[model samples]
Target chain A: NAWPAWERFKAELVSVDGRVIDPSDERLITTSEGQSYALFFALVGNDRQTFAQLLRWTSNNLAEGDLARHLPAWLWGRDGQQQWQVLDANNASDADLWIAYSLLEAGRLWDQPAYTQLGQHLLWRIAAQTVRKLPGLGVMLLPGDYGFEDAQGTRLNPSYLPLQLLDRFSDVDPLWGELAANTRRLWLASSPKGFAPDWLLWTPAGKPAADTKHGNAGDYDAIRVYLWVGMLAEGAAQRRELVAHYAPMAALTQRQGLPPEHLDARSGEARGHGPAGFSAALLPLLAASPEHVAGLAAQRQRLREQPVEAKAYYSQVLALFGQGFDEARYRFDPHGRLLPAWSA
Target chain B: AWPAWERFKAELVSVDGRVIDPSDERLITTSEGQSYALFFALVGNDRQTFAQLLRWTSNNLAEGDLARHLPAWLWGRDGQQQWQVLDANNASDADLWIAYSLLEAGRLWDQPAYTQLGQHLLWRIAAQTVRKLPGLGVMLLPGDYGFEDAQGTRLNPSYLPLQLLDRFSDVDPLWGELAANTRRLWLASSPKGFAPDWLLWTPAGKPAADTKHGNAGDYDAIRVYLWVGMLAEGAAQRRELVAHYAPMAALTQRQGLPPEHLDARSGEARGHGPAGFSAALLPLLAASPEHVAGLAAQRQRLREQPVEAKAYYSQVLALFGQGFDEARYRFDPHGRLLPAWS
Candidate 1:
């Protein structure tokens, strides 16, 4: 029952009220992404009470006590007026998907119909609000309710559309299947040179153009693409192809002996070495094939030598997912169903 | 520009470059049509039309990028009277043809964009459509969806074009293995000299009659003879493939016509095939000295009963077979395109 990293993460980042606080920011911001991830971690750790507490806090603080009617606010922290409330009202699509995924899995695993009902409601709302049909690209998920589209193009985050989640959601509706196909198109097309950009723009010209606003940087956001793909069940749709598509990143990390801090997503050039969390993030992806054995070993050593700091919220989160999978704490079935270790 | 090709464009292809199958009530455009027209434009050195076709295909069929998604097989006017992809599943033959055309266009036209896009599509093809049939090594599925079930793995003999797979081998080593496996599957599926439209490879590791189409060899099976006949003399499997389907050549010679239908298992002929069918056997007959007289007879037959300009499938077959016969284009031993312009 021991999950030390999560235990330390809770001790450092999570409050008694079950809110995930990032202490590094002056406002000590708490994001829905953090809350959603904490809920997922709780489920993986099989801490039933903690999962309940986290969901309650998220619904109360971020969704104004009713997650079924309201998508959780993306950012919640101190305002300019010094009041502790939501700093941003816009909902993040990735966080919403994760929240729904975790809740649905929790419902399935714990046999809670209320959780399942709420999860399905959130998914229905997400589908109604965030999904849009890009001109030539068919149906796709936007990053959020606002600020992702402009005169230039409709912006997209490659990391926001994970195949496993979409696969799971397909059981709910065939619409999700279309989104999954379009998501695969967007993900693979954005990384033709083998490094996914943090942001992609589909323009009026009907093509996957580089995001002029974000440029071609593949750093923090794009790392999760690798992690998600690496953690995909062996029988999951597109798992093999996705792994083959992202092999360049794994190769780059192996050659550099650390995941790069930033990549020229188009040119395939690397910059500075990433932190210990970056090494941790790549372990699952590297562990995918025997060809990556040496790379996997080196990164494992890197993580051991330079463990993620307890108070570093992002690093700790990354370590949780990367190391959690490495430790076999949980797994995603082919349908994206969760299989927690304790249950098995 | 070839006059017949220009006529083909006028009759069969839309102004925006969509190939319309007028035969279908919905006026469907198969990925097969678009991909074949891409090659036709390339052969005719009509770069403008080639670009137009590629743009339409990428935007409408491949979801804005051929590099990322396979071109969905069927697109047409749906029940709602909206023009969209009616079937999102991909046909492997069309995928191969599209990739082959892109790579050849890249080489012949000197465009790296086409080459890179071709390479990318090949990778997706290998990952998505190529499967390892039990005890049969790696073989290409007819589409990205279905074709495998509790019964057995369904396979279309027409989809395993040796020349396309041969050309692909240069880009990656996996294609070479695929080509070898394809040769084995193609040969095994045709125990008799005629190819079946579809075959099922049983779990017991043997080719059997397809549950859906049975062992009848007709329209879909015709292309196997066409593809095998067009292979260059030096191509790896050309000689054996030609010799294996010798009964087809012998049958055509004795009957003075290629049969419309043949019981592939029993070697029983049915109705007489159309003029286009006779045209399709030109290259195969040319390659066979024993059936050399069939070539002259088939040419006379084509002269007597010309394929209608609006006939899509027959015209496409005629274009390939007659074009090759007329020295418009030839496939090298490595299966690279040798357009007359080049």
Candidate 2:
């Protein structure tokens, strides 16, 4: 079933202007919704018009303190006010990165300078405060603001944020070569058993926290990270290596052949029983081929054949870009609906 | 960790010689243990000794007539008995094939006729009874018997057993071309979904007399049938196709990973959790350069040129295989070991 949940998601959870409504009226307007919405739009292939609508809505609605000086968590709505009002948008590193990514994608798709500028601003903000230098790994989470809270009240870790931002920067800005290199160094140093742990509590950097099993330490998350890195870096070897690790975990989840949420690290057994938002979120990642390889091959083929359809090369690149969001939505809501307000 | 279970399994379950003592003293001897042992030995590089051991094991274990087949299933065992007697030789076809594989491996390793004899027995049994006609799929279970004992016994509709047997027969020439052709015909006649039912009733040959879900009709059994058919054909294309169709299902377990059992038809969701056995088993079916391209490339490079001359390929394979298996097991059991008896 394709995006069955979209209607309910748009009607109840998403604001009329397209900003994601906070789950509880009492809660602060945070970047969780923005990040998730960005992911959602990315998956659905929202047009430039839709992207502009969302951007305008968030900008106008957010209140002071709600939007960060450097980057905006853009606290626009809180405590039953229909209209947007800026609240405390102080320290939200992960949110900034996610929003930056959304802006970068929007800029790439629409060739809009403003969106790219916004993304660059967010990255500069993150670079200034949130990033921390470690012994081996150059940059890591600085323990300020992360993402949304889980059922257990644990905030999403920001260990992966640098990599995410670096990837986006590398895409939009050619001068981010140093940043990309630093991010890779940190990733390699911090990852354990091919995955970064939930928290990088140790100084040696990538080693897992004591008393933890490697499989239990976010196998899929690590895989997702690898997929993104490999794809963005155009590292075919890394992509294949990561997929090889991910395939079995994916296979183990297949109930009659569909995927699920978590897998038992020790047993390689699937943990959940149904189609999970996270699992569905990986759809695009699974479908994607290396852009560098395919893109170059298509270009060479077009040059040789002298075909009339020159747009085919650009179309392939656009298609690859579109897949990022398509997969995001699929993983978040397989039925094409946003997660319920209560769940969010 | 390298199937540390083998050593641990010995302590967990009481073993009276070849008979594993559990709820009942059932002689459930098959080539599974032997095959696993051989596979392990091959990887361990004890080829000569392992080959010798396989030959001796096959010579002593080969038998014919599934109705009286002693090596296939759990049998009743008495104290001081040399080996358990075959009680329910009417085991599943999957079980039969797994046993036969061990025999085949033994033959491949040692080239003994006794191993050939074991495969021959599987062929004769299937030819006489398991094969329904010139081309339909093999009966999932033996006709005269039912699974377990109850007031109204439930027949197991699972076709995996027969499918595995068919696969084994196709590979082993002891069954001849007719049996192989029969296997192909059976696969062709079945639907493409790969989900076979739990049991197929005798006499009418209709399907299980009782099914709870309305969708549990013949059409729904396509997934199981497809899976079995893939096993039967032993084709890489079939395996790739199956993997492609089922990748999402495999990806979405409890925490967004592979689970133990999924609804065969829709890949909707079923079963308790990830089963450890699937983790150990499924990779072999889905193995490809695409699946493990980086690993394969690295392995090839090491194979062609080695500075230190260490056994890098073998070590990497074992490590990767173990890593894959462990991931599956964790999903199935939630990182818990089975009970000592279980």
Candidate 3:
């Protein structure tokens, strides 16, 4: 197969001009997350032209200039401004990590020094602007360059600390090493109940607290946390702790007969049965635990009952990660290095 | 993370994870790479990689079971261009590492299977590789059959990284005696404070140069310093042995490079050493700031002649030397490891 996932992403989720439109078909908006995933998918597919075009679309619109010099806006095309239409000017560090990682790894894989140099510059900017040094946590990455920290604490997305990107950053500089070490710590704290939260607060004491804004509910945002945990290489560091800690989600999903669309992190309460997409997201985590053999069969049944709808961008991305991993389309090495099956 | 091991496995090892040398005409695998992979995989706490590496070793080298037979020393392409074992003789040095790593990993990770397998391996080594010599007492032979014979036993001092034996002794007490004699063997052979690649034991109870090999310390001897440097800080006699080999630091400092070959008796050096040699000397150089500063310059010299990623032996040197230099890993006195993740 010549990467149906990439083709699907391009044909449905992304535009010819390389803007990854939310094919939700509602908001004429593009998300930094969407572009980031596109960059990764493009790299995996070995589509150099698509990678370049994606970058071109970013700087020309969202970034206002070269992304190497300017950070891309988190959201765009709202058509909601008194003077300017660009909705939010916030920069998302999570997206930055993926973009930089995609560029640098692509550079190394394809033997292009230009991409490597650009990635190095982008990484430096991210470290200077987005990365922070907390009193207790040592080196910490903020959600963005601004608007994350306040009187309460710094908001952290547990899912944002993808092992592949963090480890890749560590190789580029010594500063990234200490920051990389804290990823697992944050994951441990945020998912104490084996159910992850969408947003967490890092107190002055370096403890994770339920977010005041989003409360302790884990829904669409927290689903990524599960996806990343499952995507990590089998030989990755902290594999035992992360997998064991997150094992209960599988048990819960099996009991419910489908993954819960929403979870209350503070309580054991679950509501709103998840659709086919949510069950797809649970595949890798469910497959990891031998006790969850029933959960695996059940998820397959759920997905078969109602296939992921076309134009459903979130479900498609989830399916790509879940099924691509289940089929060994790609694998991350222990150090968070990646090798798509094609590369192998 | 074990990416270095991944790269090593990808570029140098076979699909089954048999550690091989591409530079060799026959594409041969030495017990050396196999054991090194086991140690590294264990160090990284990477069970999947470790399991695959062990599977390859047991299946091809040990004839399906390491407990029943010693792994063959060399495997490679035959004249017919098919892969096969080139030599059935086992390398004792490599066998020591494999058993040592498995035992320590079993202890560290609490994997009982490793403990069981390692103990059995140690028992096999005791019966096959270890022999009582006249002067050397109980010593390890270089191989299973070839090194032990009617005349006397031939040994490689570098093969016994005595520190590994200190940990292995925990599994079988006989290894303690073997561990205790390494210092004496190291002391006797390197009279001039330089180790030899090969040593001989005659009935008269003396350690001397083998008849076949003159008194020269080269590539094999270089690793003796590496293994010695790797000794845990708390390991007994580690400091004493390091001081005994102080002349190595002196020569490396003055020359700004390690010599490719050296005559142990005369303190003579020859041939500018390669990058791999510089990589191997990091542990020995850590003793002094002055020596370390000097090492930095020599390391730059080596950097000019970059090591090939696909080269088995050179990359092995980098994995040890640069890995230690970067503080990516370390060994405890008990031979328990602290990999980069730790």
Candidate 4:
């Protein structure tokens, strides 16, 4: 009743130094993703102290001690020689965006100008480092500044764009509006078959194509697309169209009683049943369907059946977002202001 | 097709439709019980019993809909005197059998609901339990979780019945590959001519003795022969399997008894296996006049042995092995049953 989601996450996923470890993987890597999620959950719980430690850890470990000057590296773990270090230096725009969004939110809610100034710097740097123009897609956020752009096209992870955060980012920088508008365009075009691919390539010919290097499977990454869309305020631009575009995933889930783990986006065939977290991600998408109510109810039962385990790292992150929203612990306003349960 | 099923139901199955194992100190129900029961009910063409068994399985082992969850392998009394699921991990043999039974029952009974449920359950099993071993091709795990970790992938040869897999292939091509792998596993693991109780598929791309039980085959392995023998005469791999496993049949005939335990690697018999072991071998022995006489001898021994009214496992083997020898039911090339009533 008192927002146990964040407390549970911190107890299991976050280290004493505030790094979020994904225990599910054998290598036991920590991603900037874990830090970003920890930042948001801490702010929602109004724990400024927890927020500071998480921010410090991200700055020191991921950004090489200066967060304002560099985007946090996407992944950190052991190398081939078994030495512990940063495995990949490529920056993840979504994790950066979330960290910046959490900082901006905490700055406003807690009246800390330093946090706002730091967040503004981080957001603008993210815009500078990651945003790029595609021949057909206008301006877009590549998954990272490097590696994603190739001879074929520019790669994008659609779930990376949390539109509400983009709207909020626009307050500090005008280019963010372009990032925000193009995200909707990118999202609507990539999902012609109503299912979003985990990774997509925007071609030089001005067409959205499935990234040949990454394959056309919609799996773990694309799941967040529905989660973000569901979290949007009702009046957010193209919210209705976004919901309509993804109705088939909800319908398949409702009809099948659970979400499929791997969906061939080009073909409407889904293979393998997804984990409990995938079901949690669908609550926001299926909320609009009366027919899917039972399916959604069944997923709630499944999450209960599979109570959060410390080792199931990703499922817990999803549970925090999906179940947290269902309990009315928070909501996103049309103007991108967070509406926490305690705010009322 | 299966008169023994009624006896099985009356003795072992609870009123609420759980299959009770009396051997344990506390009453227990296993996924194996319900799974085996589902098969018997299907072969006998009893829809009423099938529905009840499925309901109890769904209600207790899985939450309500098995398609959404795997059935917990064991359900029985707990330490505090309360009855509940003892282990939540699935046993893939039971999972596979339950799926195969449901799919066949749907076709045999002319029920669409059962087929749909079967397809969904099959998909869940394919996702939750199937794994790709480095050397073993795509194999079905012994359960939904565990068994695969830092060491390597472990497999139970008996869990995959070739007949059931053939039926699965009709639904999805994945099962056809699984069926092929099950055959490969049988041949590769039983070079000494006796099937192993458990085997490991190493990450290094080779088959070896499982870490838990190395090079041994006992009660669980006895079924590997029984299942193969139960395959219809027209099945593609039936003859190939019989030729490879003729050693087990030969050992039973030479000793005038089934080996209760064996070192599969060395082909050493530990002791005379139980009368049920002999009863389980009858379907395989029908190929030769000498083995056919050996089959009759086993049946006579079974008749002479004391029969426990509540004996579940022995009775199950008797039903499958004894039922097949009497021509009460026969499977076609497609693994479709042609029961006496039909």
Candidate 5:
């Protein structure tokens, strides 16, 4: 029965502390830890309590931690001991962004305006901390210390998460228009191959380093921003064309069914193995599902009844859980368990 | 006395999320709802418990929600009972990375790995949904048609999150090197100025669209890769030099904080407003805080540690939080809490 593995996976996910383990095994506690697992189980097995419990738990906890440090680690309960603190010491952008996401999610699930307010406040904090005004250049850099230094030793360079987060933030807040507009401008200006050079030293207005495999590895960061512009903006031809362009690179990685952590950028060869569980997790959420396709047919009808409600609800359902029972099944059993269960 | 928000504001953030707010209110979230709330809190505050609680809630209730739907109207305890949903809709690339960040946080917090695994699976699904090819000189767009229909038969370009997630996965050894390699090849084959044309369409070896704003906007993505290279492969100078060699467009804002897009080939301003926050954030992350007079003493101490550790501090404490107090802050509030708080 498809139920067996799903059940087993679910059961195994419950830690010794009775908390559910995130299905992906990276073992870092992040905003998605409880919420994602709860959603997975709820959608597939109708485990509403699990979802509720996770939601409530997160609402009460997970709010005061060092989001930048904790987020990159993973999304989960801190086990009361805070033992699994594997600070990357190398990169902390992911952590900060994750915490931002955590607050956003907390606000959404609990319907608590405070959570949302705090989240917005953090975004502003992030901008003030990182943004710098160059004398002539309008570009903003993701600033931090390079080479393990303190604030005095820190330098600024552009990174992907901050921009993507800003773009997403803009969807809820319109003021980000300037940030988004500038982001797009900078994106087009710096890329030689429709891809950004890993670094732009603004002081001298030149490349900080040669674009190599490692330097160019952040090409993945552009994926989300490109998609945002392509799908949400006014330009259509440009958007479609942009999607079509990156399709191959996306496809090359897709052939393996798992996204890589990095690519050569020059050879289209996978540079490293990943399934960067954290970043990779978002893939399914962005791609289309059968439910949305089917929902479109009845959209007008739903709109007639509760135009705003229907649209908002239907869109949320589609965006969050996908459409139809089958797609829901795929979402839950991404490993193709439904087929086996049905066969039995 | 020194709490999460204070710590984060003083140390972690490189770019202020408040500045990006459309209301110009400098608030991270709007009444309408958005992920910025959580993001800002996490980066600015060091409240471990809050982070934990939020993670649990998201995994349990909102795991399936799309980026577009959440923090707006769809967030709720019961995934099925939320006010709205994205229905059959997939998340945008930004959504994917947001999820990725959650997963990473999950791992760090000692939560279940499923979220991380789920993130991987989700990326695989996204990869499968691509309707086009990589070398066609086009942009990577979001899938499942959430907002694209408004523009009528057009697609939006995917942002740098795809590359960042892919790179993270590569480091984790989940995906092969092919994805990373393809990106490199695309970059090497791209025209000078590192700019792609309007369509991302290039004639094999021919130069593509190179807008000052568009290309320059990619600075953050490029910076991530450069740092990745420097950190992962010890190519510091080469990566560091990226900022030195790249073409920089002038800011259009009178204060010089706002970015304007320029033609890659002509270096002419093509668009107004600052491009990417990363341009500002990344530089803050990369440059030694010591260079900025007031904070030199504190930053010099940070330089003594290992590069990896230093980078971490820069990311969590400096860039994402208080690193810019010396140059960016109007009143130099580094490591000091304001009296406005209790």
Candidate 6:
């Protein structure tokens, strides 16, 4: 209750039934992603009751009555014909990681064996289904169960591999350790120009290539690469070098006076200035760089001056992460465990 | 093919060629048992027996027209004690095997009518049991209705034979894609290289332990390795599939017999399988030169303690595995049956 942003987010976005409504969509969709973020935020706010509700809703609706047995479906909404049902029955690995991480940490902090077992089952499912051993790239998480791998090569999303989450998962299984090592390789190999592509291709011959489907644009999905990288805990593996690799993005934000809403990842060209939420998302990254500390303060000030829109679900979610981290509402430890202020 | 086929027919079949389950009190007649009888009859080059079995299955199980209706999977004494269709539900695997046998019978015996019926039955199977699973693409369900639910699609690993899928592909391209999906399902389900009796392809696109059977691979799973072994030497999936299930062969070698039950995920083995199981694994063991010693051991076991008359399932397996090992029949890369009589 002490967290004002948490209270506001819960009141506005989450329905009485615990569905995280994406109001912007005509279908009024709720994604596994929305539920995943809500679970994490609920944990940070120490809202145990809401966390339980969200988990119940997600398992019952998206996972067919059991999270321990099935991965949550990625998309659900009103159909074109006005039927409320699952729209896409695919697993989104990024959301799965967040859900697994939150549940595992919740069990650790709250001392709930049920949560721990559920989390372990989900993590194992993620390993079994989404984690792939690329011919030359070792172990990597695919974007989902299918469509990411084909003749040209396996397509990858850099944002999906959060370093801190992988760090924590490494303790659970050696497969996760191999995944973390290969993930760092993926990170470096993917960001050739210091800007992450929303999607990239990894050839069978053990090399990276431009994604045929998504091309070289680093737009919405790529923004999280910076957010996740910047939020890595101090003393985290490769934290310093990983931050250094993205020095160009910080430099560009410093020069342009605002984070770019869209950029060509290969050429490092910025387009129009981003929304206030984009500035907020860059707060952690900017703060990570000593040279760009001033830009961090400026972005935090911008977030206060132009607050996230109440009905804009995505921006509000991003603001919660970027602003919450900046305010020390929570921190991911070096091992990727959640360190909620309430926990202390 | 003779003595085994002769004994099976004499003991299991009635005057009308109904493959009855003498082991069951209900004296049940499954389309699966009937399908096997049809396949054995074709393999033995006994055209008379083949026609009799086909006629009985069609008249009793399919409402007297094989081309018009998929055969009901179960038929036996009803609760009221009347001898009639007990359960009208169709088993997809039996449907597939029946179709495969008919197709091969048509080719070997030059019976165009049998080919037509086979094609028609396959089309009905496709319409009822085949669907494009979210991430896995086109897949065959265990049956038309009971195999799918909100959790996901439940599948039987024993139900799929690469040869049948390949053979069906020539008739419909959907089957080719289903073959790919089958391969994917098999690879995921048998991570520890042991086939499970039943697997769930959850909406998540990952294979999970079935809600009913859990992870144990027992009676229904032995056929997975058997089918893989019997695949034509140059079959497209022969080498990889045989290699995929190498652990089963290794375990069989270590125990000098197959395990009665195995935890596919944990790689745990327990209890010695029956003589039929040893007979079942013959083709798989014969597939590999390194497994030659194991093959010889299993062969001797089958000879020393042959499948009993009452063991319907074991007899069916021996007819397939031992019949093939003796060069009585073979399958082409295209899944076409090649009887020695040809």
Q: How many residue pairs clash in each candidate at the backbone level?
A: 0, 85, 1, 2, 351, 0
Q: Can you write out model 5's per-residue Cα lDDT over B1-342, one digit (the tens) per residue?
A: 334344433432223221112222222222112222233343333345335434533442245333212212222223454422323233344344444445534443445653444354333323222222223321233443332221121222223322333434433322212234324433442334323222232324332333222344342333332222122212223333333323321121122332334343444544432222222333333343322331232244334431222122223323322323322311111111112121
Best by lDDT: 1
True contacts kept of 4: 0.00
TM-score of each: 0.55, 0.34, 0.50, 0.55, 0.32, 0.56
DockQ of each: 0.01, 0.00, 0.01, 0.00, 0.01, 0.02
Q: What share of the true interface contacts does each candidate keep?
A: 0.00, 0.00, 0.00, 0.00, 0.00, 0.00
- Any runs in candidate 3 off by more than 4 Å, and if so which? A25-27, A78-85, B1-342
Report the lDDT of model 5 for residue B267.
44
Q: What global local distance difference test value does model 3 have? A: 0.77
| Model 4 chain A: ten consecutive residues of lowest lDDT | A124-133
Off by over 4 Å in 1: A1-344
Give the per-residue lDDT of model 3 (tens digit) for B1-342. Answer: 656666877787666777878888998888788899888777666787788888888988999988666789898899999888889878988898888878877877889988878866765566456654665545678876666444566878899887788877565445666778888988888887788888777757787677678678988888988888778888869889888887887788888888889887777888877777888888888855657765676578656876678888778887887777778788778666777775
Better of 2 and 6 by DockQ: 6
Q: Model 6 Cα RMSD, Å?
A: 21.7
Write model 6 residue lDDT over A107-204, tens digit each, in one string.
99999988987887777566545765466775678888766876798899998888888899867654575577788888888888899889999997
Report how far residue B315 has shifted in candidate 4, in Å. 1.2
Best by DockQ: 6
* Steric clash pairs (candidate 3): B135-B205
Residue clash pairs of candidate 6: none
Q: Model 2, DockQ value?
A: 0.00
Per-residue CA lDDT of model 4 for B1-342, tens digit only, reads 355777888899998999998989778999999998888887787889999999999999998878666799999999999999999888988988888788888888888878877876765565446644565556777975568666787888988888888877677555776788789989988998899899888879778888999989998899998988888877868889987888888888777789889788888887898766877898887765657767767777777883468887787788778777777777777666677666
Global fold similarity of model 5 (TM-score): 0.32
lDDT per residue as tens, model 5, A136-156: 333243433113212222133
